[PDB]
């Protein structure tokens, strides 16, 4: 038997008695008292009992002599017991302490502080003194056990249910008590050779465990070592059910098991912080929960951004080490975090599985601010809930094949040498991420550029295939601050693999998918851009196939020299392929090689460049989809240039196409569309060497503000099997509103053609050069201009209308309708040419023109010129009409013409009409009316040979001015053998009536002449006249 000796009460009021050799009793009366002891030793079988007024009653046993306290017996108390021994304290095997609160400390506490309930411990300890616990230390519910020393070891068991267990190794330890319980502990001050080791069991269920070790040196020496069992089961305490701290120095080598489970609710919170933290093979940190997983933190918080947890410098997870935060029955999985600031080597297993009967998967983050070695396995799958996430973040990360990276975990591994990283560049095994996609867990990889001067620019490099042949729908997002260089397939056969190769929100890098890095998603999305963050990211692509199957492919990014560039042979199969690009000097979209963008629903390409081209396709690119839309804007270049001396652009729309841009320069294209439609709004468009076939309506609208022609077609064959072509050109400059050139053929066999050209200023209207073969069931050409021509067909033009042809023009000073070339306007039912002018001519046929139809109706108005003018010293105008012909205007001048008609009718209302050198045949009546108000002739016929097979020639001239009312001159021949000839001439002033000169042969059945003049000759047959009639001849005048 050995009981403490030298007991002397220094403060407070209490008695010390020894009723037996093995029994020692202390009676406490005051709330606080300090007792100084020469030696505090309890032998085996000896009992030291405290008799205290309450559970909050306070007793202190400060050892002031002897050596290390040797406690082998049982110490029991109804209140709080504090033992201070600078020489250290040892609890042997079988020793038991059971108090309402117990503190063992090697640091002395002043008496004045103690009576004032100020529990602070600092200094006064013997160098190297340790507190070793091999027995059992237990307390009542709400009790606490604290061991603060230079070194603390617990090879026995410690049990503080519902309270706090604190093992600190620091110079100054501050304890805050209230109402007999422990509220907080303040641990500060580094000490030499600090260490707190726990090889036994510590259970603080529904409480907290703090194992803080603040060391002065230990560059690589063990400052904290837990190899036993630490249990803090219960409710998820926000301060953490288990909290470790390695201080600013040392290595926290943990080999035991930490448990913060909750069978009935949410698991506890486990936090492990320090400088260097290594978890051994047997580490079993578990934070599972019945109603949802807890939380685990190794080296810091999420992304290291939690201010309550120190960020570790290096964290190593040896193979076989396990952290489990998965839900057990039903609920969401917890969070497991591995953060370091320099180097993280991870080889262990992390479980963040959701509840089996319900709940989503947890989240796992394995990120290092410097070098990252993630080679272990992670499981955040959910049997019923959504997939979990395995997040990674390093300086720069490169995916590698397999795990044969000469890792140093257990073989040829001296102790704490794993804290010396060797593999520069944050390699990640593709095998790990392969299993992550295979087990229904998302993978997310980020970087972030470090300070300037390092080679860690924040890049991602895929140097290994990434596959997913099993599991439910998963995601995989790679968002770096540098490059997204991909040089390996990312395939998925089973399920969906939604790839998002994003750039960082403030990234200044680019995305390159080359070396035939095919990405198959078996229905998953691919979003290589960001979407709208104005994130400057180039998307270079070379022999990369993007198969989305049933997913949607969206690429976005802005590149000053090249927004999105395509090279080699690319294939992109998806429900919707949406390309969006921007540039400043280069091409916003630049497809150089073969690009086969096979889509089922919609292709959309969008671009905008200040000086370069928005959309610039020069490759052998094929784009087949239901709806393809190319929208671009360019200030100095081209919105949509597809020009290429060798490359051909094939477009196949099952439904319709729409292209928009400032200038749309299409070229060498072969487009099949449902309802094609361009729209250029700045610099017009150009269709050259294309064969654009569309089942239905085509709408080519374009406006040009430059000298370039608005709708410039050259060697284009544009057909509409069932619809109509409607073109709408507008030129505000000295260009042409609509310019047709070269071998152009337009077919609208069941529809219409409407070429509308609105000139401005000196601009001409619609233009025709070369050979233009427009075939349609209805042709309509509309033009409007001021000084140039509203409508002009200088070049050969062929028009075949099953129903009719209509031309309309309005020219202020130029010619409204001008035909200075071989025009062959064949039509079945009707042809009408309407024009109007102020200074120039309304209709001016010059070249060799033939206008075949059943019905021809010309009309025009001119203030000072000639409305209907058909004359050339070489050109011959032929009009072939089965039924009536009508010509109406102010002046009608027909020369060198050869007209055939069923019926015929001129009508001159202002300037009279002139027919000369013509051959006009019309079976039925040839009524010619003309009224002139100037000195020009009313009806002026010369060298004309007019024939009426079955009809009657009728001329009716009125000249209010002094011109000839009806003047016939030269070789005029009139055959009306079956009808009547009636020429009526009304002169005024000094004007004559009917004037006959030259040689006029008027043959008919009945010949009637009528004249009316005031001062002139009513009828004046000056030259040779010859009238042959079979019934009678009538002449009258005044």
């Amino acid at each position, epitope marked *: 038997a050995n009981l403490p000796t030298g007991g002397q009460i220094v403060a407070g009021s209490g008695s010390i008695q020894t009723p037996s050799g093995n029994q020692m009793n202390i009676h406490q009366n005051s709330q606080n008292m300090v007792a100084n002891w020469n030696s505090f030793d309890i032998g085996k079988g000896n009992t030291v009992q405290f008799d205290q007024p309450s559970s909050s009653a306070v007793a202190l046993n400060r050892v002031v002599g002897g050596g290390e306290s040797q406690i082998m017996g049982n110490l029991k108390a109804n209140g709080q017991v504090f033992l201070v021994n600078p020489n250290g304290v040892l609890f042997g095997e079988g020793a038991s302490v059971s108090t309402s609160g117990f503190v063992a400390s090697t640091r002395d506490i002043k008496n004045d502080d103690f009576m004032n309930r100020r529990y602070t411990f600092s200094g006064g300890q013997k160098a190297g003194a340790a507190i070793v616990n091999q027995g059992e230390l237990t307390t009542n519910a709400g009790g606490y056990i604290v061991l603060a020393a230079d070194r603390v070891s617990n090879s026995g068991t410690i049990r503080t249910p519902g309270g706090k267990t604190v093992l600190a190794a620091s110079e100054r330890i501050t304890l805050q008590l209230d109402n007999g319980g422990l509220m907080s502990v303040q641990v500060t001050g580094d000490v030499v050779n600090a260490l707190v080791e726990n090889r036994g069991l510590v259970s603080a269920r529904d409480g907290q465990v703090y194992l803080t070790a603040l060391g002065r040196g230990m560059l690589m020496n063990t400052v904290l070592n837990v190899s036993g069992v630490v249990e803090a089961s219960g409710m998820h305490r926000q301060d953490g059910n288990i909290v470790l701290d390695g201080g600013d120095s040392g290595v926290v080598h943990l080999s035991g098991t930490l448990q913060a489970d909750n069978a009935s609710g949410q698991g506890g919170k486990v936090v492990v912080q320090g400088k260097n933290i290594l978890l051994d093979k047997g580490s079993n940190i578990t934070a599972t929960g019945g109603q949802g997983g807890g939380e685990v933190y190794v080296g810091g918080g999420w992304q290291g951004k939690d201010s309550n947890i120190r960020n570790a410098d290096k964290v190593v997870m040896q193979g076989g080490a396990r952290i489990d935060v998965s839900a057990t029955q039903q609920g969401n999985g917890g969070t497991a975090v591995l953060w370091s600031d320099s180097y993280t080597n991870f080889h262990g297993q992390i479980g963040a599985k959701g509840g089996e009967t319900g709940g989503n998967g947890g989240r796992v983050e394995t990120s290092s601010h410097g070098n990252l070695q993630a080679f272990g396995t992670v499981s955040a799958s959910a049997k019923k809930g959504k997939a979990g996430n395995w997040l990674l973040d390093s300086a720069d990360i490169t995916i590698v094949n397999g795990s044969n990276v000469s890792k140093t975990e257990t073989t040829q591994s001296p102790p704490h040498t794993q804290f010396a990283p060797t593999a520069a560049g944050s390699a990640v095994s593709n095998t790990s991420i392969n299993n992550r996609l295979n087990n229904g867990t998302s993978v997310t990889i980020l970087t972030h550029r470090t300070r300037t001067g390092t080679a860690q620019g924040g890049n991602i490099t895929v140097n290994a295939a990434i596959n997913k042949g099993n599991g439910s729908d998963v995601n995989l997002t790679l968002q770096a601050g540098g490059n997204i260089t991909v040089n390996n397939s990312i395939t998925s056969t089973e399920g969906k693999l939604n790839v998002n190769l994003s750039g960082a929100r403030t990234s200044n890098g680019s995305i390159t998918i080359s070396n035939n890095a095919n990405i198959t998603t078996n229905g998953g999305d691919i979003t290589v851009g960001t979407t709208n963050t104005s994130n400057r990211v180039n998307i270079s692509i070379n022999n990369t196939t993007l198969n989305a199957s049933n997913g949607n492919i969206q690429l976005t990014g802005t590149g000053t020299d090249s927004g999105i560039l395509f090279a080699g042979n690319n294939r992109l199969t998806a429900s919707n392929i949406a390309l969006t690009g921007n540039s400043t000097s280069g091409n916003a979209i630049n497809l150089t090689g073969t690009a086969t963008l096979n889509a089922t629903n919609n292709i959309t390409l969008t671009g905008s460049s200040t000086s370069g081209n928005a959309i610039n396709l020069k490759g052998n690119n094929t784009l087949t989809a239901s709806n393809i839309t190319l929208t671009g804007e360019s200030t100095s270049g081209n919105a949509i240039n597809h020009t290429d001396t060798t490359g051909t652009t094939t477009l196949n729309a099952t439904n319709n196409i729409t292209m928009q841009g400032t200038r749309v320069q299409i070229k060498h294209s072969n487009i099949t569309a449902g309802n094609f439609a361009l729209n250029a709004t700045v610099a017009g468009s150009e269709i050259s060497n294309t064969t654009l076939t569309a089942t239905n309506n085509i709408n080519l609208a374009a406006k040009t503000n430059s000298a370039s022609s608005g709708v410039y077609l050259k060697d284009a064959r544009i057909t509409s099997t069932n619809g109509s072509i409607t073109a709408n050109g507008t030129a505000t400059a000295n260009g042409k509103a609509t310019h047709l050139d070269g071998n152009v053929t337009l077919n609208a066999s069941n529809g219409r053609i409407k070429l509308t050209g609105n000139g401005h*200023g000196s601009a001409s209207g619609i233009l025709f050069a070369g050979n233009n073969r427009l075939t349609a069931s209805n042709i309509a050409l509309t033009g409007n201009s*001021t000084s140039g021509n509203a409508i002009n067909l200088t070049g050969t033009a062929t028009l075949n209308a099953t129903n009719d042809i209509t031309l*309309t023009g*309005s020219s202020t000073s130029g010619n409204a309708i001008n035909l200075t070339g071989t025009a062959t306007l064949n039509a079945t039912n009707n042809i009408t040419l*309407t024009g*109007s002018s102020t200074s120039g001519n309304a209709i001016n046929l010059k070249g060799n023109n033939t206008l075949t139809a059943s019905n021809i109706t010309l009309t025009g108005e001119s203030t000072s010129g000639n409305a209907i003018n058909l004359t050339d010293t070489t050109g011959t105008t032929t009009l072939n009409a089965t039924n009536n012909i009508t010509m109406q205007g102010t002046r009608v001048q027909i020369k060198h013409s050869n007209i055939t008609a069923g019926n015929f009718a001129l009508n001159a209302t202002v300037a009279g009409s002139e027919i000369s050198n013509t051959t006009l045949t019309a079976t039925n009546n040839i009524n010619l009316a003309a009224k002139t108000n100037s000195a020009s002739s009313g009806v002026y016929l010369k060298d004309a040979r007019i024939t009426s097979t079955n009809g009657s020639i009728t001329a009716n001239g009125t000249a209010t001015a002094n011109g000839k009312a009806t003047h016939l001159d030269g070789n005029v021949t009139l055959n009306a053998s079956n009808g009547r000839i009636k020429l009526t001439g009304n002169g005024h002033g000094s004007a004559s009536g009917i004037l006959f000169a030259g040689n006029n042969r008027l043959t008919a059945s009945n010949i009637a002449l009528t004249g009316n003049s005031t001062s002139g000759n009513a009828i004046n047959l000056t030259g040779t006249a010859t009238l042959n009639a079979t019934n009678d001849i009538t002449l009258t005048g005044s």
Partner: antibody, heavy 116, light 106 residues
Framework: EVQLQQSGAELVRPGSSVKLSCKAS????????IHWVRQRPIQGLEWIGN????????HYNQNFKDKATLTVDKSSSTVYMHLSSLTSEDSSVYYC???????????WGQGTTLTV | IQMTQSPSSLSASLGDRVTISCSAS??????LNWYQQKPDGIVKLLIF???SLHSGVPSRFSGSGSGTDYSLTISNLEPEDIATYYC?????????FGGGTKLEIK
């Protein structure tokens, strides 16, 4: 000369309807579109809509989209402006104009008074 | 598209160089007509396009400008000119008009 003859003064109670006429002569009726411009009292001019007699194609200002309607009779060379649900606010002088495309409103009608 | 006129009214003397500036809400290229409405109510077209005379236009009328600013100038003022000069844009649908500038004599 090219003339744009309209109807005389038209006065109705608010909430009524009036069909304004724009009769054109001296030019090819199907060679230019007819315009419709309102001069609000002491507030500046405003455009209502146009109809092209060639095909009766119409473009309407959105403000008058439910307020006005245009009809054309090529036989009489006349374009008729229809209105509905008139108020005192719309009481103004309504002009019809001969619009080409590049020459725009080179001739205006005499204008009718629509007091409502 | 909204049209701007300034000044809303102007007073000057016979034969004085008259300038009616007409600023636009944006660059309308040259889609500008200068209608002159006589006080009776007859509305003509004087300068279709930025500077392009109409038929019944005396040589005194002449415009200029590009982009957002345009001006119409009557070189010699005579009492026929007294009217309100609505500058009209027609670049963008719907077409709009200016605020009117009455040209009063002094």
């Amino acid at each position: 000369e090219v003339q744009l003859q309209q109807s005389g003064a038209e006065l109705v109670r608010p909430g009524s309807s009036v069909k304004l006429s724009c009769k054109a002569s001296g030019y090819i009726f199907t060679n230019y579109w007819i315009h419709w411009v309102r001069q609000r009292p002491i507030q500046g001019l405003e455009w209502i809509g146009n109809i092209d007699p060639s095909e009766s194609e119409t473009h309407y200002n959105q403000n008058f989209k439910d307020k006005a309607t245009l009809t054309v009779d090529k036989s009489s060379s006349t374009v008729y402006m229809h209105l509905s649900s008139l108020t005192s606010e719309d009481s103004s002088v309504y002009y019809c104009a001969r619009g080409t495309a590049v020459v725009d409103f080179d001739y205006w009608g005499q204008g009718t008074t629509l007091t409502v | 598209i909204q049209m701007t006129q300034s000044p809303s009214s102007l007073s000057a003397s016979l034969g004085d160089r008259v300038t009616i500036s007409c600023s636009a809400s944006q660059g309308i290229s040259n889609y500008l007509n200068w209608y002159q409405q006589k006080p009776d109510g007859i509305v003509k077209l004087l300068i279709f396009y930025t500077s392009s005379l109409h038929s019944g236009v005396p040589s005194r009328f002449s415009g200029s400008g590009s982009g957002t600013d345009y001006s119409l100038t009557i070189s010699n003022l005579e009492p026929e000119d007294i009217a309100t000069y609505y500058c009209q844009q027609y670049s963008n649908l719907p077409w709009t008009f200016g605020g009117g500038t009455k040209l009063e004599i002094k």
